[PDB]
Ligand binder design. Structure first.
Ligand SMILES: CCCCCCCC/C=C\CCCCCCCC(=O)O[C@@H](COC(=O)CCCCCCCCCCCCCCC)COP(=O)([O-])OCC[N+](C)(C)C
Ligand SMILES: CCCCCCCC/C=C\CCCCCCCC(=O)O[C@@H](COC(=O)CCCCCCCCCCCCCCC)COP(=O)([O-])OCC[N+](C)(C)C
Ligand SMILES: CCCCCCCC/C=C\CCCCCCCC(=O)O[C@@H](COC(=O)CCCCCCCCCCCCCCC)COP(=O)([O-])OCC[N+](C)(C)C
Ligand SMILES: [K+]
Ligand SMILES: [K+]
Ligand SMILES: [K+]
Lengths: 449, 473, 449, 473
C-alpha cells in the first residue's frame, strides 16, 4: 500500500477535503467576478474571507506532494514522493500558486491590478469540471440530475459573469449619465451595492432569455459592441441548452412508451385470433404484473439472459440453493445434482387466483414455491372442497410427474407468488444420468406415509 | 377479473356478479367511483384558480367566491368520510383489501388524511363570523394556499391516462402541458400583483407606474393586467410596457424567467418528441418505397414491375408488423400453453403423422409451438438442404418445387393443415423438395432433434404405427 | 367507362380546373379577412373581383353533379347521376352555396353583415387541405418541399388573420386615441389603407416571432385579452413548427452520415489487420465508387435484394436479355437456357485501371461487359505488351473457365465499367443439366479460328 | 491511386512518381493547389464583407478599401488564367482528364468563366479614372454585389469537409452555421442602413430617429448601430430602442424576421441533431449497464458477480462493435477475394484437412470465407446438434466439452489454426462435442453442403488421401 505518513487518491478524508475545496471554488466563482466589476480596493467583509479561502487552497497545494496518482499507461498507483512531486511541478504548480496570493500583497506590487489579479483565481475552477466528469461517469448518481445540474451552473455563471462585465463598462465611463444604468437611475454611483447588482442581473437575465423588455439597453457604442458578443454567445449557448433538454426527454419516456406498446399488441393479437373472453384477460393480467414485477429488479430477462451459462448459473445458484436444499424430496441426494437441478430452473410469477396446475391435466411440469402461498383445491361433483394450503419453500405437482399420472389437486394462488418451474423431460434427463434417484423415490414414498 | 378490471382508466361497470363486492364497501375500480373522482378533479381545477386569486386580490374573498368555496369544501368533506369505505390494492400481495378496520388505518396513518382535513377547513369562513371582518394582511392570505394540496388529484388523472391505451398519448400528453403552463402563468401573475399591492409606495410598482389608482379599480382589471404581463414574459415577447420597477419585483421577475427557460425548453423537448415518434413508422415505409421508384426510374423498367415490387414490399411490411405482436414468449408456460392449446390444438391433432399419438406427447408438442409468418413467395426450405426443421401450415398455402437443374415445376399445392418438409426429417436425408409460400402464410415449426428425441427416448406408448401412417402417405 | 356527356375524377381537365380553384382560394384567404377587418361596405376594386370569384365557384358547384367519386368501402368508381347527386347534397351543398352569394345581395337583407358574411367564404378553404393531403401522400412531389410549404402557409394565414382582427378591435373603438394604433399615429383613420395594413402586419410578425419591440402594444383591456389568446395560440404554434423542422433535418442528413460511417469502418478494418498500402486504397476506391454509383439508381442492393426470386428475375432479365443474346458463345442455344443464365448473374462495377482478371490466376469466374471498355494486357519478361481491348457487349475469361486452365491475358479497365459475373460452379451446373453445351463449345472452337 | 488521392479534403502530396502528372498541368488534387484554393477562400471571406459594406455605406469606397479590392481582384484574376491548366474528373468515366484543349473548353462553355470575369472586374476602380469621382447613387452600388458569386467557393469547402473523416463532423457543421448566420446579420444590417441612407426625410428613419446627424458621422458608427439592430432582431431580444419607423423599413423588417423563423428553427434542429446522435451509443451502453446494477442491487448479490456480469457485457459490446466493421460484403468478388487471400490464406492452407488439396479448390474455399467474432464464453456448437457447419479458428481459443448428462468436462484446448466441429460434418453424425469459446475469438465458418458439394462433385484431382489425413488425426 503506502509508506509511513502519506496519502492516497481514493482515501475518504481526501474525497471529503476535496468536496469542501469544491464549495470554496463555487464561492470564488461568485466573488472573483464581483470584485472585478463592482469593487476597486479590498473592502473589509471580503478582504478577510478571501484570505481564508486562500489559506485553505494553500493548505491544499502543499498537501499535493503527499497524494498518490494513477497512470493512464500503466494503471499502477504511483505513491513515491520523488515522482508525484515532479508530476505536480509538471503543469499545475505555479498556476495554482498565483491563484492563492493575498491580494493585499499584490496591491503593494501595483495598484490598478486588484480586480484583474483576483480574476485569475478563476483558475481554481478546473475542480468543478473534474467533479462534473467524475459524477457523470459514476453510476451511483442519476445522470439526469447530474448533467441537468451542469447546465444550471454554466448558465448561472454566464449570467453573473456578463452582469459584472457590463457594469464595469458603465462604472469605468466618463460622464456616467449616458450609460446603460446611468440612463435609468442617474445617481447610480451612490446606491446600495446590492441594488447595482440586482439591476445588472436583471439586464443579464432579460437579455440572456431573449425577453428584452427594453429598459436597460446599451447606450454607447462600447456597450453595443459588448452586447453584440454577449448575444452571439447567448444565441449559441441557448441552442445547446435546448439540444441537451431533448436528449434528456426522449431518453426519459422510454420505459412507459414501451408498455402501452405491449398492451396494444396484446389486444390486436387477441382480436385477430378471436380469443374467448377468458384468455385475453389472463394474458393482460400476466403482462401487467410483468410491468410492476420488472419495474423493480425482481424480474429481468430481456438482457440478463444474454449472459453466459456459467454466469447465469452462479446467480440462480446463489439465489435459490438455500431454498432448493430445504425440500423434502432432495434430502441427501448429492453435492452436484442439486447444483445442476437448480441451475436449469426458470423462475416465474403468478397473479392472485391464477391456478398454475389444473386437475386432470397432463403432468408436464412441477413447481417449487419461493414466496407467496396457494391452496390445493380439488374439483369434484361437490366442487370447491379446498384441502390444505402450501407455503413458501414447498413443491407441487410432484406426484403426477414422478409417476406420470394426471394431476390430482388443482393449486390456485391467493397472492402474488414466485415459483421455480422444471419440465418433466429436463428433470428426468438429469436424474436418469445419476444413481441418487433411489433416494428421491424413497423420500417420495416416505412422504406418502 | 381483477387486473383486467383495474387496467381501464375511468373504471369499469361492476354488476351483480359480486366477485369482490362485499356490503358497505365501494370498490375503487367501480365506474361510479371513478366518475366521482373525475368530478372532484374538475372541482380541483376551480380550487387551484380561486385559491391563488384570493391570496393576491383579497377583495374577491368578500363576494360570490365565499359561497363557492363552501359548496366546493363540502364535496371534499364527503370524500373524507367516504375514503373509509373504499377498497385499495397492495403492491406486495395484489389482493383487493376491502376490510374496514384495515382501510380505516392506512388512511389515518397516511399524510393524506391530515392534509385532506387541513385543506377542507373553511378557515376564511369560520374567521368571518367568530370575528367581524374577512381576513386581511400580508400573511393571512397564506391560508388558502393549503388547497393546493388537491393538485395531487390532477397529478393522478394525468398518470392513469398515460397508461390506458384507449386514450391518445398525443392528446393527453399535450393536455398536461396546457394545464401546467397556464396554472403557472396564473400563479406568477398573482404573485407579482401580490407584491405590488403590499408595497409601501404604490407608484414605484410595475402597475402603479401605469395605473396610479390600481388598488381601487376592479379586481378583473388588475387580473387582466397581471395575466398580460405574465404571458408576455413567459412567451418571451416582452414588449416592455409593463416591467419590474423595484428590487422586489426585479428579483421575483428574474427568478420567474429563469424557471421559464426550463419550462419552455421542456415544452419544446416534448413537442419535438411527439412529432419525431409520430413519424418513425411512416419514414421506414417511405424510405423503402422511395428507392423502388428511384430504381424503377433510373432504369426504364415497365410500370408492371413497379406494381409488383411495391405490392410485395407492402406485403412484407405487413408480416414484419403482425409478427411483432408476438408478445407470448415471456409469460409463464401455463398461460402460454393454455393459449396455444386454443390456437393450434386442432391443427396438430390432425396432421396425418400425429394421428395415433399419446395425449401427453400431443400436449408436449403443442406447449412449445412458436408460429411464424411468411410473405407470399419466400422459400422456407431449399432443395438438398440439411434437414434441420419441418413445418406445419395453420393457414395459407405453399407449393412443392422440384428443380430439374434447369427448371422449377410446381409438383403440388398444399393448404391449411398439412406438413411441409417432413420427408427429409423422418428419413434424415437432404430435403428433397423446395417449399416456397404462395399466399401470406402462417406456419408452426417443429425442429429436428427436438421432435425426434421427444418421440424416441421419453414415451413408451406410441410405437410401430406412425411408420405405418407415413408409408400410407 | 362513362355515359355520353359526363366527367371523371382523374381526368386531365378536371385536375386543371381544380388547381385553378386553389389560386382562387388563396385569393379569398387573403381577401376574406381583409374585408372583415379593414372595410365596411363593398368598394369598387374588390366588389367586382369577388363577384368574379363567386361566378367561378358557382360554375364549380354546378359542375359537381357530373363528377364521379370513389367509395372507400367498395373502391368502384361510382358514376351514376342519381347517386353522385345525393352524395353531394349529403354534406357540402348549401355550405358551398352560401359561400358563393353576391355580398351586394346580402346587404339588401341587412347591413352590419358584409364583413361577417364574407367571412364564411373561408369555408371554401377545405380545398387547400385536400390539395395538401394529396400532394404529400403523392410520391412524385418532394415531401420535404411539400410538408414544409404547408407549415409556411398556415403561419402566413395566422399572421394575416390576427392582423385584421387586431385592427378591427381598434377601428371599432370609441375615441380612437387610446388604441394600439391610435397611440402611435393619432390620425390613423385618414391614412392610406396600405399603411394601416403594413403597421398591423408589423405588429403581427413582431408578436408572432417573439421579438416584441414594444412600439405597437395593447393599450385597452379588450386588446390585452385578444393578445393573451394570440400569444397563447402562438406559443403552441411555434412549438410545433420547431418540432416539424427537426423531423425534417435528422431525416435529411442520413445518406451522408452513413458514408463517413463507412470510410471510417474501412480504416479501422485495414488498421487492425495490417493491410499493405495496396489493398486499403483499393478497398476505399471501391467503397467511394459505391457512393457515386448508388447516389443514382444505377446501384441498389441493400433493399432491392429483399425481393422474391421471381421479381428479381424479371428485372435482371429485362435489363440484360438483349445484351446476353448478342454474345458469340450463346448463338442459338435455347429459349430458357439464356433466361436462367441471365437470371443468376450478379452485376458489378469497377473503377478505372482496376484489373478484374490477373494473368496466371485460378480461373474462378468469367465476366460479360455491359458498358465501358478495357484492354487485354499480358505480363511477360517484356511487360506492358497490350494486345487488343474489348468493348461493351463482350465476354472475358471464357477460355480459362470452359477448359479450366490459368487465365492467359490480364484485362484492365480504362473506364468505370459494369460487368456481369458468373461463377464457374453455377454455370457448369446450369449447362450440365442441359444438352446445348455442344453448341457452346462449338462456338468456342469456332472463335478460336 | 486516384480515388484514394481524391478522398482527402485538403489534397495530397504529389511526388516524382508521375503517374498522372504531365508537363504544364496542375493536378486538382495536388496539395499546393488545394492550399491555394484555401487561400482564395479566406479572401472570399473578405470580399463577402467588403462588397456588402460598400453597397450600404458608400463613403468606404474612397479610402483604404479600394486598394484592398485591387489586390484581392488580382489573386482572383490569376485564378482564371490558371483554371486552363488544372485537371478535372469526369463523372461518367472517372478518368483524370488533363488535356489542355479539353480543359480549355469546359471552363469556357460553363457559367463559371463568364461569372468569374464578371466578378473580377474592378468596376469601381476603372470608374475612378475614366471619370472624375467614385460611383454614387442608389443603383450604382449594385455592382459589387457581383462579387457574391465567390461564395460558391465557400460552399465548396464546407462540402469537401463533411466527407473527409479526418475532420470532426461536429466542428465543421457548427462553423458552417457560424459563417452562415453572421453573414446574414451583416447582410441585413447593411440593407437597413442602405434603406435609411437613401430615404427622403432623414429623420423618419430607424437611425435618424436616434442620431439626427447620422449621415455625417463615421461609417463605423452607422455600422455598429446596424449590426446591433440586426442582432437584437435575429436573436429575438428586440429591446425596441431601434425599430422600423417608415413602411419601407417595416416591410423589409418583417421579411427579415420571417426568414429568421426558418433560420433559427434550422440552427436549433441542427444543434439538437448533433447532440442527439452524439449520445446514441453511450446511452445504449448505459442502458445495459443500468439494469445490471439494478439487478445486483434489488437482490443482494455479491460484488464479484457484478464484476463478472459487467466485464462480460463489456466484452460483448466490443464484439458487437468490431463485427460492424464488416464492410467487405458488397465489394466485387475480385477485391474481396484478394483481401481474404491475404487475411486467411495461411490459416486455411494448413489445417490438417486442407493439406493435400488442389490450388483451385483452396482458392474456391478462401474466396468465400466470412469471418465472425465471438465473446469469451459463448457456445457455438451444442452437443448432439445437427451437423450444419464447422469452424476454423484464426485467433483466440476454444475448449472441447463432453457433457456426461450431469457434468461438463474440458477434454482439450484448441488455439489458433485448428478446426472445431469437423467430426460430425465429415461423418454426418450429430456433433459429438460442445465447442465453446474461452477468449474473444475470431472463427471462419465453412458450412455443410457447401464444402461437401465442392469437394465431391466439381474437382477430379483430390481423392483418397483426405480420409487418410482424417484417420491420421
Ligand atoms: C459563438 C458561439 C458560442 C458558443 C457557446 C456555447 C456554450 C459553451 C459553454 C460550455 C458548454 O457548452 O459546456 C461545456 C461545459 O464545460 C465543462 O466541461 C465544465 C463546466 C464548468 C462549470 C462551471 C460552473 C461554475 C460554478 C457556478 C457558480 C455559480 C455562480 C453564479 C451565481 C449567480 C462542455 O460540455 P460537455 O458536456 O463537457 O461537452
Ligand atoms: C431551472 C429550473 C427548472 C424548472 C423547470 C422544469 C420544468 C417543470 C415541468 C414540470 C412538469 O411537467 O410536471 C411533471 C410532474 O407531473 C405533472 O405533470 C404535474 C401535473 C400538474 C397539473 C397541474 C394542473 C392544475 C390545474 C390547472 C388549472 C389551471 C389553473 C387556472 C389557470 C387559469 C410532469 O412530468 P412528466 O409527466 O414526467 O413528463
Ligand atoms: C393553445 C393552443 C394551441 C394551438 C396550436 C396551433 C397549431 C395549429 C396547426 C394546425 C395545422 O397544422 O393543421 C393541421 C392539418 O390541417 C392542415 O393542414 C390545414 C392547412 C390549411 C392551410 C390554409 C392556409 C391558406 C394559405 C393562404 C395564404 C395566406 C395569405 C396571407 C398573406 C399574407 C395539422 O397538420 P397535420 O400535419 O395534418 O397534423
Ligand atoms: K423579445
Ligand atoms: K422587447
Ligand atoms: K424573444
Amino acid at each position: 500500500k503506502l509508506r509511513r505518513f502519506v496519502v492516497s487518491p481514493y482515501d475518504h478524508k481526501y474525497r471529503i477535503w476535496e468536496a469542501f475545496l469544491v464549495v470554496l471554488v463555487v464561492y470564488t466563482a461568485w466573488v472573483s467576478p464581483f470584485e472585478f466589476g463592482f469593487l476597486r480596493k479590498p473592502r473589509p467583509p471580503l478582504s478577510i474571507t478571501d484570505n481564508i479561502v486562500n489559506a485553505f487552497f494553500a493548505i491544499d497545494i502543499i498537501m499535493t506532494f503527499f497524494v498518490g496518482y494513477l497512470d493512464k499507461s500503466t494503471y499502477l498507483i504511483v505513491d513515491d514522493r520523488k515522482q508525484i512531486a515532479f508530476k505536480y511541478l509538471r503543469s499545475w504548480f505555479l498556476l495554482d500558486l498565483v491563484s492563492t496570493i493575498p491580494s493585499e500583497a499584490a496591491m503593494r506590487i501595483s495598484s490598478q491590478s486588484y480586480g484583474l489579479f483576483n480574476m485569475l483565481r478563476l483558475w481554481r475552477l478546473r475542480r468543478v469540471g473534474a467533479l462534473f466528469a467524475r459524477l457523470e461517469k459514476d453510476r451511483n448518481f442519476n445522470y439526469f440530475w447530474v448533467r441537468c445540474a451542469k447546465l444550471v451552473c454554466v448558465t448561472l455563471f454566464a449570467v453573473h459573469c456578463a452582469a459584472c462585465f457590463y457594469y464595469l463598462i458603465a462604472a469605468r465611463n466618463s460622464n456616467p449619465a449616458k450609460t446603460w444604468i446611468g440612463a435609468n437611475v442617474a445617481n447610480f454611483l451612490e446606491e446600495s451595492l446590492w441594488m447595482r447588482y440586482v439591476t445588472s442581473m436583471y439586464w443579464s437575465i432579460t437579455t440572456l432569455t431573449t425577453v428584452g423588455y427594453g429598459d436597460l439597453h446599451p447606450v454607447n457604442t462600447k456597450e453595443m459592441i459588448f452586447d453584440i458578443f454577449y448575444m452571439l454567445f447567448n444565441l449559441g449557448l441557448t441552442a445547446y441548452l435546448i439540444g441537451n433538454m431533448t436528449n434528456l426527454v426522449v431518453h426519459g419516456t422510454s420505459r412507459t412508451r414501451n408498455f402501452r406498446d405491449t398492451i396494444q399488441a396484446a389486444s390486436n393479437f387477441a382480436h385477430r385470433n378471436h380469443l374467448p373472453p377468458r384468455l385475453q384477460d389472463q394474458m393482460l393480467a400476466h403482462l401487467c404484473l410483468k410491468y410492476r414485477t420488472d419495474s423493480e429488479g425482481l424480474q429481468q430477462q430481456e438482457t440478463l439472459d444474454a449472459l453466459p451459462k456459467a454466469i447465469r448459473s452462479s446467480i440462480s445458484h446463489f439465489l435459490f440453493y438455500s431454498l432448493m436444499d430445504k425440500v423434502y424430496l432432495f434430502r441427501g441426494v448429492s453435492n452436484d445434482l442439486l447444483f445442476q437441478l437448480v441451475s436449469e430452473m426458470k423462475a416465474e410469477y403468478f397473479p392472485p387466483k391464477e391456478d398454475v396446475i389444473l386437475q386432470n391435466e397432463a403432468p408436464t411440469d412441477f413447481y417449487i414455491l419461493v414466496n407467496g402461498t396457494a391452496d390445493l383445491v380439488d374439483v369434484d361433483t361437490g366442487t370447491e372442497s379446498i384441502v390444505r394450503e402450501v407455503k413458501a419453500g414447498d413443491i407441487i405437482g410432484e406426484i403426477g410427474v414422478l409417476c406420470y399420472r394426471p394431476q390430482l389437486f388443482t393449486v390456485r394462488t391467493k397472492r402474488l407468488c414466485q415459483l421455480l418451474r422444471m419440465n418433466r423431460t429436463t428433470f428426468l434427463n438429469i436424474i436418469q444420468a445419476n444413481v441418487g434417484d433411489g433416494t428421491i423415490i424413497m423420500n417420495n414414498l416416505l412422504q406418502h406415509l | 377479473s381483477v387486473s383486467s378490471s383495474l387496467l381501464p382508466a375511468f373504471g369499469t361497470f361492476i354488476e351483480d356478479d359480486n366477485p369482490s363486492s362485499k356490503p358497505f364497501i365501494v370498490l375503487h375500480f367501480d365506474r361510479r367511483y371513478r366518475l366521482w373522482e373525475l368530478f372532484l378533479v374538475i372541482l380541483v381545477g376551480y380550487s387551484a384558480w380561486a385559491s391563488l386569486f384570493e391570496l393576491a386580490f383579497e377583495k374577491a374573498a368578500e363576494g360570490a367566491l365565499l359561497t363557492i368555496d363552501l359548496v366546493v369544501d363540502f364535496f371534499f368533506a364527503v370524500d373524507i368520510i367516504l375514503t373509509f369505505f373504499v377498497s385499495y390494492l397492495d403492491n406486495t400481495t395484489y389482493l383487493n383489501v376491502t376490510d374496514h378496520k384495515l382501510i380505516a388505518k392506512r388512511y389515518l396513518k397516511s399524510v393524506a388524511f391530515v392534509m385532506d382535513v387541513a385543506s377542507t377547513l373553511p378557515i376564511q369562513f369560520i374567521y368571518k363570523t367568530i370575528t367581524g371582518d374577512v381576513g386581511r394582511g400580508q400573511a393571512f392570505g397564506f391560508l388558502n394556499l393549503l388547497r393546493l394540496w388537491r393538485l395531487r388529484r390532477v397529478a393522478e388523472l394525468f398518470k392513469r391516462l398515460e397508461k390506458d391505451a384507449h386514450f391518445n398519448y398525443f392528446v393527453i400528453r399535450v393536455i398536461k402541458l396546457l394545464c401546467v403552463t397556464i396554472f403557472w402563468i396564473h400563479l406568477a401573475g398573482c404573485i407579482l400583483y401580490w407584491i405590488a399591492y403590499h408595497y409601501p409606495r404604490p407608484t414605484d410598482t410595475w402597475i402603479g407606474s401605469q395605473v396610479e389608482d390600481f388598488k381601487e379599480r376592479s379586481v378583473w382589471l388588475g387580473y387582466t393586467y397581471s395575466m398580460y404581463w405574465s404571458i408576455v414574459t413567459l412567451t418571451t415577447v416582452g414588449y416592455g410596457d409593463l416591467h419590474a420597477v423595484n428590487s422586489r419585483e426585479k428579483t421575483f421577475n428574474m427568478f420567474y424567467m429563469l424557471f421559464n427557460i426550463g419550462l419552455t425548453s421542456y415544452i419544446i423537448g416534448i413537442m419535438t418528441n411527439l412529432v419525431v415518434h409520430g413519424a418513425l413508422r411512416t419514414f421506414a415505409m417511405r424510405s423503402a418505397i422511395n428507392d423502388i421508384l428511384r430504381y424503377t426510374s433510373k432504369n426504364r423498367l415497365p410500370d408492371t414491375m413497379r406494381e409488383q415490387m411495391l405490392a410485395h414490399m407492402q406485403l412484407k411490411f405487413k408480416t414484419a408488423e403482425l409478427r411483432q405482436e408476438e408478445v407470448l414468449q415471456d409469460l409463464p408456460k401455463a398461460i402460454r400453453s393454455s393459449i396455444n392449446q386454443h390456437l393450434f390444438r386442432s391443427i396438430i391433432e390432425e396432421a396425418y403423422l400425429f394421428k395415433g399419438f399419446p395425449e401427453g406427447l400431443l400436449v408436449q408438442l403443442v406447449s412449445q409451438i412458436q408460429a411464424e409468418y411468411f410473405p407470399p413467395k419466400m422459400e422456407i426450405i431449399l432443395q438438398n438442404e440439411i434437414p434441420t426443421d419441418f413445418y406445419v401450415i395453420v393457414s395459407g398455402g405453399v407449393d412443392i418445387i422440384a428443380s430439374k437443374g434447369v427448371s422449377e415445376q410446381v409438383l403440388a399445392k398444399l393448404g391449411p393443415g398439412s406438413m411441409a418438409g417432413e420427408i427429409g426429417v423422418v428419413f434424415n436425408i437432404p430435403q428433397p423438395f423446395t417449399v416456397r409460400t404462395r399466399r401470406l402464410s402462417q406456419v408452426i415449426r417443429i425442429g429436428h432433434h427436438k421432435f425426434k428425441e421427444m418421440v424416441q427416448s421419453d414415451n413408451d406408448v406410441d410405437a410401430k404405427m406412425i411408420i405405418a401412417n407415413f408409408m400410407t402417405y
